[PDB]
Amino acid sequence: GHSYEKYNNWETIEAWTKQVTSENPDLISRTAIGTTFLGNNIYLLKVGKPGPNKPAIFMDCGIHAREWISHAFCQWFVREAVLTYGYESHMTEFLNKLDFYVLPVLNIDGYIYTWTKNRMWRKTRSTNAGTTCIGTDPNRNFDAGWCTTGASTDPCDETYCGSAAESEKETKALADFIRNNLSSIKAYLSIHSYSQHIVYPYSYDYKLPENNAELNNLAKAAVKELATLYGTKYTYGPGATTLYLAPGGGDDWAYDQGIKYSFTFELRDKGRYGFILPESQIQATCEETMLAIKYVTNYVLGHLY
Ligand SMILES: NCCCC[C@H](NS(=O)(=O)N[C@@H](CC1CCCCC1)C(=O)N[C@]12C[C@H]3C[C@H](C[C@H](C3)C1)C2)C(=O)O
Ligand SMILES: [Zn+2]
Ligand SMILES: [Zn+2]
Ligand SMILES: [Zn+2]
C-alpha cells in the first residue's frame, strides 16, 4: 500500500524499491550497497538510460530518521523520472546524459524506530560503549573535519560524532560507494528538513570553498526557480556561515573528494510543523523541490569536469 502522497514505512519503501525497478527495467536498476547496524539492506537506485561513460549525480535522503519529508522526496524524484521521461524535454535529456544514484533511505534503522517507538528520533540505532545511550549522527560521522566543534563527543547527544570517522556501517557504505565511483560523480545532493535552506560547503570550519562565487550564484538561482511554483522562500549559503558548524557532514566530505557541486537541502517548513510536516504538504513540497534539483542538474550538465 505505497502512495507518493503519504509517508510510507520501511517495509513499504523497500517493496517499492523492488517494484519500481521491475516496472522500469530500462530506466532503473537496484543494488544493495551495504547493511545497517541491525542488518537491513541499504538500497541504491541507479536512475538513467544506460550508456557508456556517463557522468552521475548522487543524492541521499533519510540520513536523519525523523525528517520524513526527505524520504518522501527521494521517492518523488524517482516518481518524476519514470513518469516524465519521454514526456518532458529536460528530464528526458537528464536521464539520457546522466545517471542519478538515489539512496532513498540511508538510516533505515532509525527510520523504523520513528515508526515504532519515537517519532522524533534522529541518529542511527548502534550501541555505544560505557553507556545505554544509543546512536551516532551520520551527518557528523564523515571524515571531514571529523568531531570538531559543532559535533559532540557525548554518545547521549544528538550530534554525537561516533567512535571514529565512518564508525557507522551506514556512513561507511555511502562513503565507500562514492569512493568507488568518484570519477563518474559530478554532484552530491543531500536531502534533509527543516527550515527551507540550501547549504553548500563548508560546515566543518568557518571557511569558504574555492568556487564560492559559483556556488552562491547557483544556490541563488535554484532558490529562485523553486519559488516560481508557490512563492516558497528559501535562504542559502555556506553551511557554517548560514546555519551552524556541523563537522563530519557528507556534503563537505564529498566536496573534499573533488565533487565541486555539493549541496544540502533543508525542506519545508520553517517551524510551524517542523519535522512533523503533514502528509497534505508532501505533493507541493516535492513539486517545488523538483524545480531546484532540476535546475542544479541542468547546470551540472552544462559544466562537466
Ligand atoms: N552538512 C552541513 C549541513 C547539515 C545540516 C543538517 N540539518 S538537519 O540535521 O537535517 N536538520 C536540522 C533542522 C533545524 C535547523 C535549525 C532550525 C530548526 C530546524 C536539525 O535537526 N538541527 C539540529 C541542530 C542542533 C543539534 C541537533 C539537535 C537540534 C539542535 C536540531 C540537530 C545537520 O545538522 O546535520
Ligand atoms: Zn537531516
Ligand atoms: Zn510533477
Ligand atoms: Zn558557466
Residue in 297, 206, 203 with CA at minimum distance from that of residue 252? 203
Measured distance CA(30)–CA(47) in Å, rounded:
9
Count: domains in the chain? 1
Distance 85 CA to ligand 1 centre (A): 34
Q: Which of 116, 299, 133, 148 is nearest to 224 (CA)?
A: 299
Calculate how far, in angstroms, residue 300's C-alpha sits from the geometric centre of ligand 4: 9
200 neighbors 234 (Cβ within 8 angstroms):
no
For residue 290, the CA-to-ligand 1 centroid distance in Å is 22
What does this entry list as its resolution, in Å? Answer: 1.8
CATH code where residue 214 lies: 3.40.630.10
> Do the annotations mark residue 64 as ligand-binding?
yes
d(CA 187, CA 184): 9
Residues with Cβ < 8 Å from 224, sequence gap 6 or more?
none
| Residue from 116, 28, 140 nearest 78 by CA | 28
Instruction: Give, using CA atoms, the residue closest to atom 17 of ligand 1.
Output: 195
Check the annotation: does 85 bind a ligand.
Answer: no
Residues in the chain: 305
Dihedral in degrees, nearest 10, Cα atoms 248, 249, 253, 254: 170
Separation of alpha carbons 4 and 25, rounded Å: 20
Enumerate helices (H) and strands (E) in the chain, giving the number of each. Answer: 9, 8
Q: Which residues surround ligand 2, an ion (CB under 5 A)?
A: 64, 67, 192
> Is 193 labelled a binding residue?
yes
List of residues 6+ apart from 88 with CB closer than 8 A: none
Q: Which residues contact 25 (CB under 8 A, 6 or more apart)?
A: none
Q: In which domain, by residue range, is 42 found?
A: 1-305
- Give me the amino acid identity at 87: Y
State the closest ligand 1 atom to the C-alpha of 266, by its place in the atom list counted from 1: 10
Active site residues: 266
